[PDB]
Amino acid sequence: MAALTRNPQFQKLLEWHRANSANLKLRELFEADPERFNNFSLNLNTNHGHILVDYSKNLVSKEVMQMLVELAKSRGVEAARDNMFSGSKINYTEDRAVLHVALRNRSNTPIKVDGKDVMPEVNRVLDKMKSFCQRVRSGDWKGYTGKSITDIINIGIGGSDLGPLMVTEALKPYSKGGPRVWFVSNIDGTHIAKTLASLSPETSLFIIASKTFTTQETITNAETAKEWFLEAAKDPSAVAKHFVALSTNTAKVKEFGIDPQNMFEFWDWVGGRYSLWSAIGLSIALHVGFDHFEQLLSGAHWMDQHFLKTPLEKNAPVLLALLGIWYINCYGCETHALLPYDQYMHRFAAYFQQGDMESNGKYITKSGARVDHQTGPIVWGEPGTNGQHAFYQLIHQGTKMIPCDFLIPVQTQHPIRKGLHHKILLANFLAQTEALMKGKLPEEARKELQAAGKSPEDLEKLLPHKVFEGNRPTNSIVFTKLTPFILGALIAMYEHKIFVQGIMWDINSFDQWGVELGKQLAKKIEPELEGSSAVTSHDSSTNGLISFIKQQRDTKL
Amino acid sequence: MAALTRNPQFQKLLEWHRANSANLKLRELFEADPERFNNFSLNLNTNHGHILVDYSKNLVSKEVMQMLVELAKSRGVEAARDNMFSGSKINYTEDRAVLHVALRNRSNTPIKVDGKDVMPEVNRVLDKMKSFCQRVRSGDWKGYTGKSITDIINIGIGGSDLGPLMVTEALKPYSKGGPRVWFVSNIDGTHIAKTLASLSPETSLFIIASKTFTTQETITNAETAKEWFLEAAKDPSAVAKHFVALSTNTAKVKEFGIDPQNMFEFWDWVGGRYSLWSAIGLSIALHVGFDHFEQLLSGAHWMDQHFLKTPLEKNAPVLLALLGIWYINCYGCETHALLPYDQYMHRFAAYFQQGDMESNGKYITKSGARVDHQTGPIVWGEPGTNGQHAFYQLIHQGTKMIPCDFLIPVQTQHPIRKGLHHKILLANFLAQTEALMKGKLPEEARKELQAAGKSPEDLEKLLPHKVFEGNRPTNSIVFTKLTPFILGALIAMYEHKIFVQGIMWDINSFDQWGVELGKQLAKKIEPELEGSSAVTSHDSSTNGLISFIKQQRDTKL
């Protein structure tokens, strides 16, 4: 078996769940104990705003939380955390350190990899980012015809795309005086084509973001951009004014034709899905300014210190992780919904699809054993209140148990109509988790239908459809305002939740071997698409789909 | 029990699954039968492009498909379909017809509700839409200062937002000569505030889209838009040049202050999540032109006729529905991923989140009995190839079974660089489903490790991490080009899939009683947020969150 399932604290938790979980009823838990909110919430004071993590609407008791904390201790969470923070090579399949925490280490306390402090190089690159941002944003940096830069285009995919996009979207109010930012990621030619159609080569700066600098989508997109640029500029020296690279691969950056002084370096111990804190964040810094980028790093650093120094029972990422384990490994819930009541946060869920699913969508443990339990959940969601009018029907009255994280800032960036919109937004945020918890009993629904003047026949017909079973668990995460600092703290909180779950499952949260096969097979198919000849080299489906492509590509529509 | 579980064809299917499903291996199924693709795919010729529905990479044999088709028949799918198309009041909890098919009934064959043909009124509103589109797009419709309209702003949420947004995004290449379109939906003030910031009241036309015309988010947003407009126009009579309504509620439209001739009507038998085909599609028609809108309707009509006339065993929406039943009710899969390899289709999954989840996220059957089986899945996804660099790690190497629909057009709208980008996109599309099916064997991975110069110790340790178990089922849906017609056919296909699944579960796909509780509780909370007085009227969590909101809203960061 595997480390988690062999663990006696886990088997105790699972047995308790089998015997006792059906007796957990949220409505009754709240009625019986006025102190429930106080006992199952964390009000964190960062000194730059508060983050309230309210986990009281979860299917847990004091006993359950004690068992979960005991399990975390038994699984070596604290030791594993310390090892990450000290630069130990905990990414064991790649023999790499895992040091996104170094990127935002504002204290500058040495963190060593191979006996060498990484902080000098972290800070050197940050200083380079700061200098570059000043030059571009001030208008001093000129394009090949002598004009100021108006548009920045980040070209990258996955970890080189999702973070910068999510953060620039989330921090849009902080972008006055910054250039417009565009994100090109898909190989689908639509993406670059529609972006380039709205740009001038004279005033556009391309940021080629790629840890490896060999990803086919990114390098192809980058080459397409360079061809478009050179068609206008007709001078290879002009590339140095319009193309920069964010990478670990100096040789491949040089090969592509980017100036050595136009390379913003990061390191192998920066995972792609943990990379927005590094050079990869350059588009963030250009868009909102380096000061705000530093605030973002500082917020993450605050949360890092919270994670590092706080007892497990009061440790936010640990508690979130443990609640997740409870729902995944005891209740068997396949998914986790992220529901921010904030339009600016509309790419938050998509970001953590990579962060969570690429990290913990694994099946082999440190011991070499295949897991005999569930690992990472499917992450999904849309901003409130939109989701209420799309899929909450299923959350309330479907057949699935779906743990939800509801997030909202107390203070809006746009307090229009004297705060009316935000009042309504907050009311819905609060009501939905209340509704999920409480439900509506048959007798409560009966009274409502009776009051509406329904006939005994019409009442009886409609009654069961109006019943809400409730007992649906949520987290509510409420914060003063979505500032750069608070956003940084929130992202880091989930990064650490993901880390804790990975340690408890005994998997490597920091590799991604699962992407290799698709890349290999695509390279084989690429040249087979050319020409009109039939492909017979694969299974009949792949062959048949290729035949369809070849037959349909010349039809006029 | 419930209708489905009491059904002997279902019992037979479930027993077969229990006894035999472990023997189903995709690799073996293809190896044993070179005709597999031919036997398990449908190449549909619409006369305006082909749609290939390739379901061969599913964990099904001939006998499984036979059992599934037999279940569809014994659950009354054929009869239920005919009842929908004839105007029977199959939305039984609300006593309503379900006639989105009438909206796109291009044949004009009479469809009666209460003995009255609905087609003359459907066509009257379409004619009104066509005339309005001419006036606006030509520039003849002038704003309050006499200028042509340049921007259209749809205000609406859920069914009044998702369809028009998704379709205008998908059909962007067809929008030459059309006004820019904007979609405001969230109550979050950010949404309307950032939309209005870049617009001129002189050249902007607002479309207020709401079936009921009472949805709080939409009416509040509409009133905010009107205030913003009147600040500039200072003339209440000018509202008639800048505000139109799409609704079933004539009285509430009048009450809001919209011109009677500025109302585009639809009917109660148009469900919100099935409404883009009605007046709700006005923003589509404005953006891409009425001709293209008619093509969209015509494609849907083609698929309606395919659904109506085709024997179940080769009926596209029925087969997709049945595969879904197989995975949901036999394998226990919670989710269904929609993965379009098309940037223009980036809102397709979000659309079917409502279409599928609000429809079939249900737990009460026609008899009033609770289901004792699963119903609608959680729908999620992102466009390829981006998803490959975000969450496919989990699809390939996680612990969840996840049915995936892969979709792609053969012809791209942007064949840049002599088709290079699209070649790569297609190769990835093909390779991913091939990889999911095949996996990678230890013998294959071992040789790769050996060639990479790995030591015997390192090879041993790394090997299981590099193996792909495969046997992960997919559908591949490939179509000539994403034209208005083809998009219409594709949306209709999934609409009918959802319908077939609902009938089989014995639930009502067409109501949404599950949204009521959240709305009720929000109305109670809204007035409590104003002022400094403590709120104690709820559970301690709701009270504690409100206390936090009141304490934190004055803090200066």
Ligand SMILES: O=P(O)(O)OC[C@H]1O[C@](O)(CO)[C@@H](O)[C@@H]1O
């Ligand atoms: O069009 P309306 O009446 O404003 O409703 C918007 C949405 O709200 C719902 O009624 C509830 O989610 C959806 O079915 C609908 O599409």
Ligand SMILES: O=P(O)(O)OC[C@H]1O[C@](O)(CO)[C@@H](O)[C@@H]1O
């Ligand atoms: O930054 P790179 O090297 O181009 O990689 C892009 C993405 O591809 C992956 O390696 C595969 O998903 C991600 O982990 C990564 O963020």
